[PDB]
Amino acid sequence: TNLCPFDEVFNATRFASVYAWNRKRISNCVADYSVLYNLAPFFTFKCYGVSPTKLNDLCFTNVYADSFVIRGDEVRQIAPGQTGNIADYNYKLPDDFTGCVIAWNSNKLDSKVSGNYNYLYRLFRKSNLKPFERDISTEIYQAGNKPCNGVAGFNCYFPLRSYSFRPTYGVGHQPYRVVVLSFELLHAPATVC
Amino acid sequence: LTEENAKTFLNNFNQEAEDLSYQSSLASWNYNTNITEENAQKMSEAAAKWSAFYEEQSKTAQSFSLQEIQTPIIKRQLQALQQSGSSALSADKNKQLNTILNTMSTIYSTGKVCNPKNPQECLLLEPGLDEIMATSTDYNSRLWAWEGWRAEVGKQLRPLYEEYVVLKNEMARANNYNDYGDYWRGDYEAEGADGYNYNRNQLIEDVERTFAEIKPLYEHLHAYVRRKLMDTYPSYISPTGCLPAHLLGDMWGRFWTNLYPLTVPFAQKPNIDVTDAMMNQGWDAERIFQEAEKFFVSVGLPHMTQGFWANSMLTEPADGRKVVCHPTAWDLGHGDFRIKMCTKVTMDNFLTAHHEMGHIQYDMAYARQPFLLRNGANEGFHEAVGEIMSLSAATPKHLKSIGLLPSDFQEDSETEINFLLKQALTIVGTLPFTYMLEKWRWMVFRGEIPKEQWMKKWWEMKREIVGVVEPLPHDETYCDPASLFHVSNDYSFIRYYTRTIYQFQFQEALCQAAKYNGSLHKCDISNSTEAGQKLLKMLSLGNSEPWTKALENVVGARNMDVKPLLNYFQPLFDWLKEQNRNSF
Ligand SMILES: *[C@@H]1O[C@H](CO)[C@@H](O[C@@H]2O[C@H](CO)[C@@H](O)[C@H](O)[C@H]2NC(C)=O)[C@H](O)[C@H]1NC(C)=O
Ligand SMILES: *[C@@H]1O[C@H](CO)[C@@H](O)[C@H](O)[C@H]1NC(C)=O
């Protein structure tokens, strides 16, 4: 029995920024969803698409477990077919999404004293992000007629802003580590069970 | 570039300003809790960064054009960013501006007041002991302890403010305004549709009906206090002269710590004994705020956040962490919602904790509005909303079910009248003072002439309006509107005026929504979910919608309504009416 990497992808010391989220392909692994919810009673495992019971006897193909750290309300923004600021420019889910989300309240892990700027989100994208697209690019955003030439300012905005997570924000703008499971059915032998 | 560029610029400003304002507020909180002049230095540098960024974004805002393009609340947000205050203009002109603000705040502490050249009973300026050593009802102690205070403050304040106001009104040449007096009152401009356009001169036309036609009603009350003063000691009101204003006891108009016991002629019914029931039962700072939160959530307002208790500083410090003693409700950017009140348990601390919790509840309603609209719908709304719960939580009917007062105390007739007299004398008499001070400020902001001929006319008008004057005049040495905290730094005064009317209107609306029989004062906001949502639908609005339309959508009111204030006492008014029949 080969236990699936839901340990080293959940208990990771640091997650990835939202504008560049790490998509982890996992296959040939037995998925023990029971062990996931054994850390405090404050999970937000509101599961979409499939039944709340994961049907551990139902076998899937490779599941795409990609994790990132967002705020509280942006957890609500992450949904199968809902608009906003982060579900349009950073992480969009298809209307026929199969799988669901897991969001923590990670305030004792990545809420560094005096603020940490290691978490960057993408604002001002100007074009709705197609589902499951990263777009890790550092190019100053242009809205006005004046062609920006590597210098920001009026009408030239840097599209990668910062969360600046630190404690004392509260139930609102605090780091909610989010990892979502994308269960895919693309022929092939079924391995994830 | 149209709304397409405006929305992106506004989003960028919101995102950056949120973090910068949170950092500034955190630095200010650290300074106020840990004053060591190093927190002062870091607070100063953070505030400098915030001011520089806000000025840059405001310059970009003026660079934008707002003729007709912006129909939605984007127009309101850009206007809020466009109000730049005293800034801009040529470098040569604004260079000397930085040399005025630094010395503006240093003029207050220059006055030392104690026994003249006497080491005995001389002490520095501290608010802790002033409130207990200044209020003294005596015929002699009020002469030099007051004339000297009034004189030694404005020794040269007028000859400097004469050009200060001129140079400040010269700034109005490039902000599409006309007068610095109109600058303050122009913040109410708000139009919603055709036929509801807001005139710039709405205040100067709607104030005559709300004040002048009912002035005699608020004048008989001033006659009531005249008769009480004579009984205590004779020679307090001259038959030919006028009562002195410097020996009234307090020019702050907060409370009367000496005249309250000597108010009811009978003086037989017992008074409240709240502290006796708080000290023994174990009520402290950690629990009074919890009781206030319980009261607020019994109406429908949400519970305070987990961090609110985590970082609040509701108790005295430990190791030399001096704090400026003042109850202030703090926002701290991203919904931190801290509260600063370093006080023990008393009668007034409970009620002011309720008022501060009302401030925090109002703050926890527009956290979804844009950063430029995360403010009260009006200057007077933010304090009035808290004061509504502050006054509503003070009724014995509220302090009979919790357990603070015994349940065997049946309500009495004269006791509730005595309770309402203090609250109807502490704030109702403040409205004439605020009105006269604001009208005097408006008239002197014009600066059309120095005082060489207006001196006699001003004092004649003051005598014929209220009828109080100093026994002897003074030379060019004093200035009246200088010795006060909220005039030293050039604040407004309509905030303390409209707050009373707004709070009474909201109280009337909420008690109407309560649908409770009985009397008009036993109605309480607690245990009224419908009243809770009726209040929340106004609190959770911010500056997105105009305050006029906000007040309209709740119950229907074009402007200020003093009729609810009058009807708050109309059912119980014969007691005062029957004691005013001995005059013609
Ligand atoms: C109050 O602020 C000071 C510094 O702003 C904190 O540090 C104290 O003061 C100096 C720092 O230059 C050093 O002696 C120590 O770092 C601290 N001294 C003591 C006696 O603690 C201080 O920790 C802050 N206090 C609180 C309660 O936050
Ligand atoms: C993660 O670490 C915790 C801490 O001991 C442990 O209890 C848990 O089993 C680990 N694995 C998870 C949560 O998948």
Author numbering:
A (entry chain B): 333 to 525
B (entry chain A): 20 to 603
Question: What's in the article?
Answer:
Here we report the cryo-EM structures of mouse ACE2 bound to trimeric Spike ectodomains of four different VOC: Beta, Omicron BA.1, Omicron BA.2.12.1 and Omicron BA.4/5. All of our structures show that mACE2/hACE2 bind the RBD of the Spike protein in the same manner at the binding interface of a RBD in the up-position. The RBD is highly mobile and its transition between the down- to its up- state reveals the ACE2 binding site and allows for it to bind ACE2. To gain structural information at side-chain level resolution of the binding interface, we performed image processing of the cryo-EM data by location-focused refinement on an ACE2-bound RBD that was the most well resolved.
Indeed, the mACE2/BA.1 structure reveals multiple new interactions localized in two different patches between the RBD and mACE2. In patch 2, Y501 is observed to form cation-π interactions with H353 from mACE2, as in the mACE2/Beta complex, and new BA.1 mutations G496S and Q498R form a new set of hydrogen bonds and electrostatic interactions with mACE2’s aspartic acid D38. Furthermore, mutation of Y505 to a smaller histidine residue now allows for better packing at the interface and potentially a CH- π T-shape interaction. Glutamate (E) 37 also flips away from the interface and is now sandwiched between H353 and R393, stabilizing the overall conformation of the interface. Overall, Omicron BA.1 mutations Q493R and Q498R form a cascade of new interactions alongside the N501Y mutation present in preceding variants. These additional contacts greatly increase the binding between mACE2 and Omicron Spike proteins with measured affinities by BLI up to 14-20-fold stronger compared to Beta. The cryo-EM structure of mACE2/BA.1 reveals residues on the Spike protein that increase the number of interactions with mACE2: N501Y, Q493R, G496S and Q498R. The BA.1 variant was first reported with increased resistance to antibodies and significantly stronger binding to hACE2. Each of the mACE2/RBD complex structures were highly superimposable, in particular the RBD domain and the two helices of mACE2 that interact with it, with 0.5–0.8 Å RMSD compared to the mACE2/BA.1 complex.
